[PDB]
């Protein structure tokens, strides 16, 4: 070991907390805990829960009081420009050595490495336009937006949307996408049609002010949820999802230059000789295959900038999207040599995993989780804090 900074772990555009879903571990899901798994190992790792379905910045906001302790501040001007709800939840805070000098490794999958990028600028530039909001209007300013904060030692991120997935422009994107959520939550053996009096998936919108109610079923719910601003407006995971909306977030979300960068992308598809297009690969989740793979190896569309390259996918996120952030992007992208570099994308390969088989959310018993995650595990323990310059 190099470094003694533990890792902490981030989801996507679906998860949940370890106690939510009776158990069912997003890290892990039907193979196991992965958390535990590294713990056990002798690395420690802690977990988070932010929004799944609110934006990049929601989520950072979020991921970032829940490290520190105290209530989510998701910054005035922020919040009168979109007309949700300041302030949050209330967390004791996972560590709150990191107000003293301390660091972590984030590793996160899927829509969770934007927010992970997002986060690292945050604390290190803080934002402009919040510090002006405040000096403009007296109001108080979260620390979050000041700037100046070194929590971040390095981010990994996996199956990681950083160019936006196509998936967002089917004609059906909206009832298929909660279609994916009732996929997720059957994998944990959970109902989507049974009004559960329990909590069991919490999607943290306190900031919206919504919740499920008493007598409302996961089916009911995600209904009122597509007509809610959660799902209309642009401060959202829909919108940052997009190929526009990921180009948006790249234009100001830069690599840290005191920061590594480790980039894992997935597929799960074969070409086929005659159309040029990609198809699910036998074994992908049930979901992805039918309803999501087909479009992304397919679509195409000249006008947005999404041709061939586009096409091979994990059934969830086009692959050529998930080396790192490329369009809007002043970002480095260096494929792995044996050497990880500092302030740039090391670009660690391609996997042969659909997006739910790398997090155990969908089976794969060719797929050796636990040797993936400790070898990942084994990599950041061994980044150097500091690097010095040599022959
Ligand atoms: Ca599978
Ligand atoms: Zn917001």
Same mark, same amino acid.
């Given at each position: 070991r190099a470094n003694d900074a533990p890792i902490v772990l981030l989801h996507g555009f679906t998860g949940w907390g370890r106690?939510?879903?009776?158990?069912?571990?997003?890290?892990?899901?039907?193979?196991?805990?992965?958390?535990?798994?590294?713990?056990?190992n002798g690395y420690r790792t802690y977990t988070l829960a932010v929004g799944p379905l609110?934006?990049?910045?929601?989520?950072?906001?979020?991921?970032?009081?829940?490290?520190?302790?105290?209530?989510?501040?998701?910054?005035?001007?922020h919040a009168?420009?979109?007309?949700?709800?300041?302030?949050?939840?209330?967390?004791?805070?996972?560590?709150?050595?990191?107000?003293?000098?301390?660091?972590?490794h984030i590793?996160?999958?899927?829509?969770?490495?934007?927010?992970?990028?997002? #986060?690292?600028?945050?604390?290190?530039?803080?934002?402009?336009?919040?510090? !002006?909001?405040? /000096?403009?209007?007296? $109001?108080?300013? +979260?620390?979050?937006?000041?700037?100046?904060?070194?929590?971040?030692?390095?981010?990994?991120?996996i199956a990681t949307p950083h160019d936006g997935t196509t998936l967002v422009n089917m004609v059906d994107f909206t009832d298929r996408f909660f279609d994916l959520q009732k996929a997720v939550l059957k994998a944990a053996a959970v109902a989507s049609n049974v009004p559960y009096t329990s909590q069991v998936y919490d999607f943290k919108?306190?900031?919206?002010? #919504?919740?499920?109610?008493?007598?409302?079923?996961?089916?009911?719910?995600? !209904?009122?949820? /597509?007509?809610?601003? $959660?799902?209309? +407006?642009?401060?959202?995971?829909?919108?940052?999802?997009?190929?526009?909306?990921?180009?948006?977030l790249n234009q100001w979300v830069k690599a840290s230059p005191n920061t590594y960068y480790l980039s894992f992308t997935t597929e799960r598809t074969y070409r086929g000789a005659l159309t040029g297009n990609y198809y699910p690969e036998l074994g992908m989740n049930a979901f992805s295959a039918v309803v999501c793979a087909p479009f992304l190896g397919s679509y195409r569309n000249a006008t947005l900038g999404?041709?061939?390259?586009?096409?091979?996918?994990?059934?969830?996120?086009?692959?050529?999207?998930?080396?790192?952030?490329?369009?809007?992007?002043?970002?480095?992208?260096?494929?792995?040599?044996?050497?990880?570099?500092?302030?740039?994308?090391?670009?660690?390969?391609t996997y042969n995993v659909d997006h739910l088989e790398v997090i155990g959310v969908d089976p794969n018993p060719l797929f050796d989780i636990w040797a993936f995650y400790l070898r990942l595990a084994e990599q950041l323990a061994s980044l150097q804090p500091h690097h010095h310059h040599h022959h």
């Amino acid at each position: 070991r190099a470094n003694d900074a533990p890792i902490v772990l981030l989801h996507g555009f679906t998860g949940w907390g370890r106690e939510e879903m009776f158990g069912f571990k997003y890290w892990g899901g039907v193979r196991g805990d992965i958390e535990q798994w590294l713990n056990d190992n002798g690395y420690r790792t802690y977990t988070l829960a932010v929004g799944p379905l609110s934006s990049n910045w929601d989520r950072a906001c979020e991921a970032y009081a829940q490290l520190v302790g105290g209530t989510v501040d998701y910054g005035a001007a922020h919040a009168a420009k979109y007309g949700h709800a300041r302030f949050g939840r209330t967390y004791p805070g996972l560590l709150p050595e990191l107000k003293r000098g301390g660091r972590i490794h984030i590793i996160a999958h899927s829509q969770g490495g934007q927010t992970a990028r997002m #986060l690292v600028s945050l604390l290190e530039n803080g934002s402009q336009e919040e510090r !002006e909001y405040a /000096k403009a209007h007296n $109001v108080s300013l +979260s620390p979050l937006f000041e700037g100046g904060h070194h929590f971040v030692l390095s981010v990994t991120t996996i199956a990681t949307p950083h160019d936006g997935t196509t998936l967002v422009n089917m004609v059906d994107f909206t009832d298929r996408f909660f279609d994916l959520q009732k996929a997720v939550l059957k994998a944990a053996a959970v109902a989507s049609n049974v009004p559960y009096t329990s909590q069991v998936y919490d999607f943290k919108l306190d900031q919206w002010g #919504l919740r499920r109610q008493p007598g409302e079923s996961f089916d009911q719910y995600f !209904e009122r949820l /597509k007509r809610s601003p $959660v799902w209309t +407006s642009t401060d959202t995971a829909r919108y940052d999802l997009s190929v526009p909306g990921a180009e948006k977030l790249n234009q100001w979300v830069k690599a840290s230059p005191n920061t590594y960068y480790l980039s894992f992308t997935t597929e799960r598809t074969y070409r086929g000789a005659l159309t040029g297009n990609y198809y699910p690969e036998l074994g992908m989740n049930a979901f992805s295959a039918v309803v999501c793979a087909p479009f992304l190896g397919s679509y195409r569309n000249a006008t947005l900038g999404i041709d061939d390259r586009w096409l091979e996918n994990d059934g969830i996120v086009n692959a050529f999207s998930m080396n790192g952030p490329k369009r809007g992007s002043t970002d480095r992208i260096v494929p792995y040599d044996g050497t990880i570099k500092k302030g740039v994308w090391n670009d660690m390969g391609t996997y042969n995993v659909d997006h739910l088989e790398v997090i155990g959310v969908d089976p794969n018993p060719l797929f050796d989780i636990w040797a993936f995650y400790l070898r990942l595990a084994e990599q950041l323990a061994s980044l150097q804090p500091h690097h010095h310059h040599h022959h």
